[PDB]
C-alpha cells in the first residue's frame, strides 16, 4: 500500500502532459488494435453505420518509468487525465460516444519499462457512402478510418499491434445487421495530406452484402404477378368490354399501390436503381396491356358474345392472338436479362 | 532537446494573460481562416437547414508566444487552448453545432517560432438556409455559412480567407444524394454599423436539385394515367360501364398518386411546381370523365327531344391541350 501510493505520487513529478513523449527527439509510435463487440445497424437513409469497439492503444513514454514490487500499474480516471494520450479521432466519425456507465469505460496501465496500454469502450457512428445503383443487389465496403488529429506523420505514427488482419477482431455474435450480411473486413493503413500537414490514417473496411429475400416477396413477386394478371385479360373474350376495361385500370392502380410502397424502402437518391427500372418496366407492361385492349375493342363489330348452342359472331382478335405470345415473351425476356445482369454484378 | 522545449513552453505561458488579445493596445489582430469540408449532409427542406462537418482552422500571430532556438513547430496538447487567447468566432445561421470529443476533443494547437498560432477545430454544424421551393423540384438553392466575431469590431479583430479563394477545400469531393454543388463562393466583408464595423466571412454554396428521381417517380406515372384517361375517347358511347369505370378509376389513381406523394415529399405547406403539375393532370382526367357525361347526356337526354363528333373532337383536343400544358409548364420552370 505505502509502496504503491509512493510510486503514484512520484510519477507525476516534473511531468508536462502538453508534450508528446519523444518530442524533438523521435516519433511517437502508437500500437492500435480493435475488438468489435457488435457491428451495429446500418442506416441506408443516413448512409451511416454504428459500431461498438474496444479501442486499445499502446505507446512508450520514458517519462513514466518506475521501480517497485509490481510490474504493471493501474491509474484512475483523474490520474489518467494528467498524462499525455494520443489524440486519436475517427475521420468519418459523425457522432461517437465514450461510455461512462457506471464509471468511465477506460483503463490506463503502465509497465515498469514505461509502456502505456490505453483501452476504452466506444460506440462509433461512422458514415458509409453507398452506391445504390444496384439496389437491392448492392454491396458496400463501409470504412472506419482513424488517426491523430493534431500530430503529423513526423510526430505520431500509428501501427497495428499484431498483423493488420489480426489486429481487428469481430465478435462471433457481433453482427447486429438486419438487411445486410457481414462478409469480412480488410485492414490497411494509409496517408492523407491536408492544409495542416501529412497524417497517418488507419483504415478498416467492413464489406456488407444486402439481403434480397425481403424485396422479392414484398416488391418483385407482387409486381410480376400484377404484370401476369394484366396479360391474363388477353384470354378473355373481346365482347367483355366492361370486364377487360376494369381489368386494365385496376391493374394499373395495383401497380401504383405497389410502386409507392416500394419507393419508401429506399432513401431519396437521384438516380434509377435496379428496383426502380423493374417497377417502371412492369408499369409499362400493365399500361400497354390496357392500350392493347383499346385497339382490340376498336375493331369489335358485334356487341354480343358467342352462345353455347351455336347469326354471325366476332372472330378472335388477331391482336389478342399475337399479344397472348408477344407480351408474355417480352416480359420473360426482360426478367432473364434483368436478373442475369444485376445478380452477376 | 525535449527538456529545452519544456523550459520554453513554461516560459511562454508564465505571465501570459488570456483575457487580453494579441497587440491589445495596437493594430487589430488579423485572423486567417480555412475550412476543410469533410462532408455536407441532411439538406432538409422541411427544417430549412443543412448539416456539414468541417475542419475549422484559424491563424493569427501572437508575439507573446514567439520562441527562438527551436526549429520545430510546437504542436501542443489540445487542452492548452484553454490557456491561450482564441478568437470569439461564431456562426450566425448555426442552429446546433458541436465539436467532436472522441476519443478526445477534436481540436489542435500548433505554435510557430514567429508566434503564429494555428487553432484547428472539427465542427459539425447544422446551419439554417431559407429555401424558395416554389420551383421544386426544378429549383436551385443557396446555402450560406456566416462567420463573425461576437464582441470584437474591426478595430480589435479582422477576418480574412487564408489562401484567397482556395481557403475552403473539399467542396469538389462532396456528393449529395439529391443535389449538385454548382459552385461555392467566398465573401469577406465588414458589416458597418453606427457603433462600428464588424468583420464577417461568408461561405455560400449553390445547390441544384437533380430531377432524375422526380421524373421516374412523380412526373411519368401522372403522364401515363392522363394518357390512359384518353382511352375512353376510343370506346363506343353506349359502353357506359366501360367508359365510366375507366374514367373514375383514373381519377382515383391520380388521387392515390397525389395523396401518397404528399407523405413521401417533404412537408412544405405552400404551392410548389410539382403541385401545379399534379393538379394540372388531375384536371385533365377530370374533364375526360366529364366529357363522357356530356356525350351520354347528348344521346340519351337530348336524343328524343352528334355524339360521335364530340368523341372525335376529344381525341385531338385532349392530347393537344395536354401537350400544350406540358410545353408551357416545362418552359416556365426549366
Amino acid at each position: 500500500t505505502t509502496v504503491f501510493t509512493r510510486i503514484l505520487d512520484r510519477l507525476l513529478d516534473g511531468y508536462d502532459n502538453r508534450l508528446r513523449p519523444g518530442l524533438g527527439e523521435r516519433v511517437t509510435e502508437v500500437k492500435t488494435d480493435i475488438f468489435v463487440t457488435s457491428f451495429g445497424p446500418v442506416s441506408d437513409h443516413d448512409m451511416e453505420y454504428t459500431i461498438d469497439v474496444f479501442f486499445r492503444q499502446s505507446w512508450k513514454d520514458e517519462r513514466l518509468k518506475f521501480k517497485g514490487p509490481m510490474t504493471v500499474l493501474r491509474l484512475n480516471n483523474l490520474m489518467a487525465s494528467k498524462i499525455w494520450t494520443p489524440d486519436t479521432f475517427f475521420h468519418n466519425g459523425k457522432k461517437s460516444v465514450a461510455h461512462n456507465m457506471t464509471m468511465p469505460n477506460k483503463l490506463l496501465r503502465i509497465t515498469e519499462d514505461g509502456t502505456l496500454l490505453y483501452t476504452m469502450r466506444l460506440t462509433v457512428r461512422a458514415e458509409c457512402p453507398m452506391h445504390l445503383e444496384d439496389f437491392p443487389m448492392d454491396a458496400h465496403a463501409c470504412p472506419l478510418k482513424f488517426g491523430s488529429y493534431a500530430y503529423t506523420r513526423a510526430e505520431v505514427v500509428y501501427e497495428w499491434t499484431r498483423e493488420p488482419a489480426r489486429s481487428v477482431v469481430v465478435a462471433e455474435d457481433g453482427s447486429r445487421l438486419n438487411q445486410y450480411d457481414l462478409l469480412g473486413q480488410t485492414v490497411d493503413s494509409g496517408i492523407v495530406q491536408s492544409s495542416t500537414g501529412e497524417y497517418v490514417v488507419m483504415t478498416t473496411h467492413f464489406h456488407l452484402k444486402r439481403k434480397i429475400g425481403y424485396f422479392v416477396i414484398q416488391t418483385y413477386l407482387p409486381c410480376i404477378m400484377t404484370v401476369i394478371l394484366s396479360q391474363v385479360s388477353f384470354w378473355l373474350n373481346r365482347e367483355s368490354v366492361p370486364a377487360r376495361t376494369v381489368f386494365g385500370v385496376t391493374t394499373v392502380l395495383t401497380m401504383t399501390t405497389l410502386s409507392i410502397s416500394a419507393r419508401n424502402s429506399l432513401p431519396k437518391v437521384a438516380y434509377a436503381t435496379a428496383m426502380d427500372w423493374f417497377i417502371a418496366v412492369c408499369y409499362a407492361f400493365v399500361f400497354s396491356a390496357l392500350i392493347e385492349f383499346a385497339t382490340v375493342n376498336y375493331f369489335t363489330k358485334r356487341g354480343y358474345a358467342w352462345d353455347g348452342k351455336s347469326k354471325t359472331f366476332n372472330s378472335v382478335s388477331k391482336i389478342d392472338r399475337l399479344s397472348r405470345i408477344a407480351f408474355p415473351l417480352l416480359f420473360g425476356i426482360f426478367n432473364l436479362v434483368y436478373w442475369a445482369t444485376y445478380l452477376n454484378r | 532537446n525535449m527538456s529545452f522545449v519544456k523550459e520554453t513552453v513554461d516560459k511562454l505561458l508564465k505571465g501570459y494573460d488570456i483575457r487580453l488579445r494579441p497587440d491589445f493596445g495596437g493594430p487589430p489582430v488579423c485572423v486567417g481562416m480555412n475550412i476543410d469540408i469533410a462532408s455536407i449532409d441532411m439538406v432538409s427542406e422541411v427544417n430549412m437547414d443543412y448539416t456539414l462537418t468541417m475542419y475549422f482552422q484559424q491563424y493569427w500571430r501572437d508575439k507573446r508566444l514567439a520562441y527562438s532556438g527551436i526549429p520545430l513547430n510546437l504542436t501542443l496538447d489540445n487542452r492548452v487552448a484553454d490557456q491561450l487567447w482564441v478568437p470569439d468566432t461564431y456562426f450566425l445561421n448555426d442552429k446546433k453545432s458541436f465539436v467532436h470529443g472522441v476519443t478526445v476533443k477534436n481540436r489542435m494547437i500548433r505554435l510557430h517560432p514567429d508566434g503564429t498560432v494555428l487553432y484547428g477545430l472539427r465542427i459539425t454544424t447544422t446551419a439554417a438556409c431559407m429555401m424558395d421551393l416554389r420551383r421544386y423540384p426544378l429549383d436551385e438553392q443557396n446555402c450560406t455559412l456566416e462567420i463573425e466575431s461576437y464582441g470584437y469590431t474591426t478595430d480589435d479583430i479582422e477576418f480574412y480567407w487564408r489562401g484567397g479563394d482556395k481557403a475552403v477545400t473539399g467542396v469538389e469531393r462532396i456528393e449529395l444524394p439529391q443535389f449538385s454543388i454548382v459552385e461555392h463562393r467566398l465573401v469577406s466583408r465588414n458589416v458597418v454599423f453606427a457603433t462600428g464595423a464588424y468583420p464577417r466571412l461568408s461561405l455560400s454554396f449553390r445547390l441544384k436539385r437533380n430531377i432524375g428521381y422526380f421524373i421516374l417517380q412523380t412526373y411519368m406515372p401522372s403522364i401515363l394515367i392522363t394518357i390512359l384517361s384518353w382511352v375512353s375517347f376510343w370506346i363506343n358511347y353506349d359502353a357506359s360501364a366501360a367508359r365510366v369505370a375507366l374514367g373514375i378509376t383514373t381519377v382515383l389513381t391520380m388521387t392515390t398518386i397525389n395523396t401518397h406523394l404528399r407523405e413521401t415529399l417533404p412537408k412544405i405547406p405552400y404551392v410548389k411546381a410539382i403541385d401545379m403539375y399534379l393538379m394540372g393532370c388531375f384536371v385533365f382526367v377530370f374533364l375526360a370523365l366529364l366529357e363522357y357525361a356530356f356525350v351520354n347526356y347528348i344521346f340519351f337526354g337530348r336524343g328524343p327531344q352528334d355524339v360521335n363528333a364530340i368523341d372525335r373532337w376529344s381525341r385531338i383536343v385532349f392530347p393537344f391541350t395536354f401537350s400544350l400544358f406540358n410545353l408551357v409548364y416545362w418552359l416556365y420552370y426549366v
Partner: nanobody
Amino acid sequence: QVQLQESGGGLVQAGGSLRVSCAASGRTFTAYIMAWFRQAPGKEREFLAAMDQGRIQYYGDSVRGRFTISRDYAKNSVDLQLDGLRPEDTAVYYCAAGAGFWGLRTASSYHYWGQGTQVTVSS
C-alpha cells in the same frame, strides 16, 4: 460509355521522373476509389497506389516512398508521379476505378479499367 485513358509516360532515362495521368469520362468517380496497377510482362498485375474520396493515399510496399498519387476531383482524373525510376519498373501501368469491395488492393475489386500505358525504363 465509361472510358479511362492513361496519358503520359513512355521510355525514360534512369533517374528521370514521369507523371502518368488518367482522364475519366462517362461517370464521375468522386465517390469511387481510383487506383494505379502495374503488370510486368508475364509476372502478375501489381497494385501500386490508390486514393479514395477522403483523399487517403494507399501505396504498395514496393513503391511506397517513390510514387505519389493525386486526384483532381474537379477534373475527374488521377495522376501518378513516378520518382526514383528503376529498370524493374518497366511494365504496363493501368488506371482503375471501383468501390473497393473486398479490395482496395485487389485487381478484381475494380470494374473500370484503362487500356494501359507502356512505361519503359531502359538503361
